[PDB]
């Protein structure tokens with residue numbers, strides 16, 4: 146009798162509690178139809194959401210509600226919530242308690258307004274919200290350590306001790322899988338092709354999801370690519386065309402590793418992780434080294450864990466051993482963390498009752514959220 | 516409509532037939548109609564809940580907009596007062612120079 | 614709560630049961646199939662009614678929303694002008710007061 150769902154900047158997921166996978170996951174997009182004449186279509190709706198928006202994107206104008214893990218609008222956000230509850234899930238919002246994710250270090254005003262929208266327009270019985278990173282960590286069973294929540298839109302290096310995140314140690318970076326899509330498009334253009342529309346963006350992200358490579362030394366990788374053409378792998382098109390792929394496969398995470406190729410003036414992922422652990426006190430640094438996880442949609446690249454291991458060892462003192470994990474299903478680890486947290490007898494104690502909102506304003510509730 | 520009650524009676528008599536056949540399958544037949552009724556009630560409750568959500572959202576957006584125009588009026592009045600203060604202090608400085 | 618997989622599995626069980634009862638005697642299976650189809654059409658009508666209710670809710674939600682982005686922009690620009698006037702007032706206060714001393 147519980148529901149859990151995400152706030153992903155893209156490809157948002159939703160499902161019940163105590164399950165191995167979300168019930169339904171769909172792009173987090175809302176859009177309205179433009180004003181025209183003869184409706185050439187059947188079964189039209191008010192404002193299509195998610196998969197319907199993807200299917201009929203050519204006849205819609207759409208606005209993404211959540212940017213870099215932070216939701217800009219609120220009307221679009223509640224539209225998404227309505228769509229999830231009443232189309233994909235067919236569930237009563239008044240009935241079940243609901244658990245919701247939360248981007249690390251969000252403004253108190255944003256959190257409190259989000260809770261009040263959850264509770265007033267929906268009249269939910271008892272709603273709770275937790276940070277995505279803690280759930281992602283708990284997904285791998287680990288209770289302390291560093292988490293590289295490198296999701297779509299935003300990346301967050303977050304360490305955890307005592308089972309809860311460290312506020313002052315949290316670091317933020319706006320590197321994104323969408324940024325990687327832009328990099329892949331640019332690379333494919335100087336290879337020479339035509340990719341400018343949103344359908345072409347969809348094709349590009351499909352290509353990158355199907356094919357990518359993470360290796361150790363980009364110099365020797367490029368040398369091998371220019372010498373031999375065996376790794377020059379082919380890929381289909383929706384129409385009968387065949388496009389062959391080279392160095393861009395290795396370039397897909399090179400921009401992740403060194404933001405200078407995109408000119409972000411930031412540092413690499415390994416650099417950010419090392420900076421975060423240095424911000425951490427020297428006591429639990431060995432345990433944080435032993436507990437390294439990669440949770441996020443972008444953390445699915447093949448052979449990335451070993452590269453992060455090499456980089457952190459190189460930039461770390463040699464005296465202590467590291468340990469980086471790579472769960473088989475890292476994308477949904479937030480959903481699994483939410484589900485396992487919900488399916489706990491003691492967790493029912495930390496719910497936020499409707500009566501509490503009735504008796505007091507949500508400020509003390511934002512305090513209680515811990 | 517009204518066909519449903521007669522259909523329920525006929526299906527219960529069909530249950531009588533299958534339970535004079537008297538297999539454990541009859542218990543399954545009692546269950547399938549139970550979850551038919553369950554999903555019917557769920558559909559009705561979800562319909563009423565959708566209507567309630569609609570009206571509640573209307574109320575919330577209306578109250579938010581109302582306090583919005585209150586803020587508009589107060590801020591405009593503050594702008595007028597501050598402008599007046601600007602001219603007053605300009606004249607004070609000029610008079611001090613004189 | 615309702616679940617498509619639950620509905621599909623129960624439909625499969627109903628098919629197996631109707632197969633058994635038809636093997637017993639076919640007419641009972643004919644009646645059971647007709648009853649199955651009739652509450653199937655009833656639940657289809659209920660689902661359509663619910664979808665209509667959802668469409669009503671979202672349509673009226675848009676109607677009540679009706680813009681206010683220009684409103685928020687007006688909020689921003691007006692408060693900016695307010696703080697500008699505040700700072701100018703304090704600056705002129707300080708300047709004239711110092712000249713007076």
Ligand SMILES: Nc1ncnc2c1ncn2[C@@H]1O[C@H](COP(=O)(O)OP(=O)(O)OP(=O)(O)O)[C@@H](O)[C@H]1O
Pocket residue numbers: 151152153154155156157213214277295296297298299300322323350353354355441442443444445446476477
């Ligand atoms: N096979 C794949 N390999 C690598 N990356 C992928 C793959 N499939 C999808 N992605 C990336 O994962 C991203 C979305 O992942 P996910 O939904 O887990 O994170 P998110 O919740 O959107 O991020 P955030 O929480 O920061 O908003 C997409 O931007 C996409 O580029």
